Design a protein around this nucleic acid. Sequence first.
RNA 1: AGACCGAUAGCGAACAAGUACCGCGAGGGAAAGAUGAAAAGGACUUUGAAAAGAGAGUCAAAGAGUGCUUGAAAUUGCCGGGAGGGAAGCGGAUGGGGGCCGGCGCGCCCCGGCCGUAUGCGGAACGGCUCUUGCUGGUCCGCCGCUCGGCUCGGGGCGU
RNA 2: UAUAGGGGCGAAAGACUAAUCGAACCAUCUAGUAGCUGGUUCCCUCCGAAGUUUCCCUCAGGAUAGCUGGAGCCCCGA
RNA 3: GCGCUGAAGCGCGCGACCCACACCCGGCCAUCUGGGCGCCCCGAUGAGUAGGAGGGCGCGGCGGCCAUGCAAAACCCGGGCGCGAGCCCGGGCGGAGCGGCCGUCGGUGCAGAUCUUGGUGGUAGUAGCAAAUAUUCAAAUGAGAACUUUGAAGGCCGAAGAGGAGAAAGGUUCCAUGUGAACGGCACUUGCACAUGGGUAAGCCGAUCCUAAGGGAAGGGGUAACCCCG
RNA 4: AUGAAUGAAUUAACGAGAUUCCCACUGUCCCUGUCUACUAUCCAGCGAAACCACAGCCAAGGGAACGGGCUUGGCGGAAUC
RNA 5: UAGCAUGCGACGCCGCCCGCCGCCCGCCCCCAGAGGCCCGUGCCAUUGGCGCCGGUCCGGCCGAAGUGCCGCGGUCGGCCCAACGGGCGGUGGAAUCCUUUGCAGACGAC
Length: 171
Amino acid sequence: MVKYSREANNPTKSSKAMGRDLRVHFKNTRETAFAIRKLPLGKAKRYLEDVIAHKQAIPFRRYCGGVGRTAQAKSRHSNGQGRWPAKSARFILDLLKNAESNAEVKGLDVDTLYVSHIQVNQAQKQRRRTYRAHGRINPYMSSPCHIELILSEKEEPVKKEPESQIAARKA
RNA sequence: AGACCGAUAGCGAACAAGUACCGCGAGGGAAAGAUGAAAAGGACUUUGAAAAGAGAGUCAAAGAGUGCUUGAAAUUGCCGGGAGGGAAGCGGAUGGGGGCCGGCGCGCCCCGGCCGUAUGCGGAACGGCUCUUGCUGGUCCGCCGCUCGGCUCGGGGCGU
RNA sequence: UAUAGGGGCGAAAGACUAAUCGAACCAUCUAGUAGCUGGUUCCCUCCGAAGUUUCCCUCAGGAUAGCUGGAGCCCCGA
RNA sequence: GCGCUGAAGCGCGCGACCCACACCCGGCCAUCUGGGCGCCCCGAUGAGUAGGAGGGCGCGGCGGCCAUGCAAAACCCGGGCGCGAGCCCGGGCGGAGCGGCCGUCGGUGCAGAUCUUGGUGGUAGUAGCAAAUAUUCAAAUGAGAACUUUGAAGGCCGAAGAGGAGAAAGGUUCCAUGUGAACGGCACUUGCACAUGGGUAAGCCGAUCCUAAGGGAAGGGGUAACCCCG
RNA sequence: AUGAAUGAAUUAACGAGAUUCCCACUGUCCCUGUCUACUAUCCAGCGAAACCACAGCCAAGGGAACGGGCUUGGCGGAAUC
RNA sequence: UAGCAUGCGACGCCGCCCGCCGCCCGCCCCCAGAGGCCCGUGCCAUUGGCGCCGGUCCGGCCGAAGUGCCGCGGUCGGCCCAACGGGCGGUGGAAUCCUUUGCAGACGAC
């Protein structure tokens, strides 16, 4: 959550974080959401720390065009495209760090949960242009991007407690 | 002043406008309005690479929070419904299922309740007509007397 | 630092006169003018075309009938 | 098309079937026949570009009549009517204006015009950021360091593919300190980005004085005059 | 359809002028190879335009006589580099 | 040479499976030049005394897979759910990555 996109949940159960108008590749930064995506805080961090490291790639389900492929897909099995876009990843890390912290302040459990909701939208595009040969003028602009992160005290443990009707086992 | 225009319109110009900007120069020349009743214009605390974020506070309203009334379209994300990795297309039409949703009395009898006209009183719009004028014919109300009855909202039974 | 627009300058190519030259650029006349191309925005009804003929510096147009259609007025025709 | 062959070919006869919006039949819309009480009914014909002729819908401001409004207009979603142009309602939003009838006005209706303007998607996380081979190892500082700064190592520049002094031109770009939204086609702690301060000192350098193609001031005269020769 | 200052002929020197021959030489060629460099490719970062009424299989046929799409036939597991 | 996406076989088979069954919830809907239950209550449907078919134990023939059938001795049964499934429940027995490389190689793959 912030002054809002799809929040939907409860304040007690969840924590909220947002990035605003970051200038990063929009297409790389969405995907970064798709892959994580239902997941813990600490594992996400480990996954992203891995991403920069080039340990784990972030699935490029949309976005094709010549991406570098199939080094591994890992989770997504195989699947050809993948890169490890470090800058968008670093920005998701500060977002997870905001969210984690907010969760902590709230008194949210160290155990507490997974990423209920992440979206990514193209905030705007910053304007800009560079001059070209033959007297012609071509825009080079940057895309601002907003990312919303919803942390929720239902998801990690909702999925343990109505894991019910045959269920629990690990436990 | 106005059957003018109302922010792509009206002047080029509602504002910092012949401004910003272009051309050696003559000359050319935009885009540019609106928080709120009141600044009450976001303390205090946590966090953070930065901004920002979280939580809270003000107000009828903050998706009223600063190019801040409303907030379409074109578009993006997430998500919901329909569908799906073996069968062919002007993307509709036509038929069918699924998905979604708004809408929802009569006849008779007994009890309770209320009132009554005809005639005498007492007040009054009317009428056919005549049309100077006049004659017969209204209706309801106010409310007592004298006979002699009905209605309506509900309840209970029966038959339709 | 001269020479300025049918003028200049040219060892003359129609070369060159601020990215513009078989006549610079600017602003104006000016909303030129186009028998040519394009476009011209709400519903319905009754009837429903012409692509032919003469004239015309006339044939990518005009013109005048021919073909149409409405609105009124009247009561034959194969 | 598969594709048949004493036929699913061909011909001569034949029987039954199929098949349109045609034709019939049922119910209904215009015009016309007309009829009958502002309204009802009988039957016929009835595609349509250019297009004539006629009835109607919607816009905006005006007047007379007639309302609506503390929850109006607008928007979004659906419900109802109307062939229909279009009318109407319900929910949410919005948070102040809005209609209807008649009679008028008219910057009065778009999908289009290599239409204008604005916004926005795909193109795409794609092209470019490639020829002097130029940095590398330690370290400083910093929230952050491949590109800021120190040292070492290694090169490159040579009439200046990167030395010194200057003309024009720029126009404060210089120095210092502090930053980092934008720039630098990337990072940035850096900078010729941003902000604030500060610096240029002439008797003996140059301007300045002179005069050179010429700009010419000065008759007279063309030219209204601008303007031009002398 | 040559021809004399619309110049004729002729001609040494000169020429990034037009044509031809020889020697020298050689990868132009027989006939291609290996190799360097920078690209390419992949990674982080930065990040564009043209263009876009249109879904987007082939063989035939048809049609304003040059079909990605009608018509009949035949094929196609998507997506991605 | 290519070729299981002709919608194939075989071999080898494994943080909890699955072999055999109680109880319930969805989809299609015979062989064959003619043939295919003895005494009862009860409108029904339920429900009770008591030769020919249907799962079965154990095995063979087309079968060479998928796939089926048919018999010597007996047992649970008669005169809903086959081909699929979807569970509440009882009893019972691996690979990608990684790291270093290549016979391989633009990435991925091998």
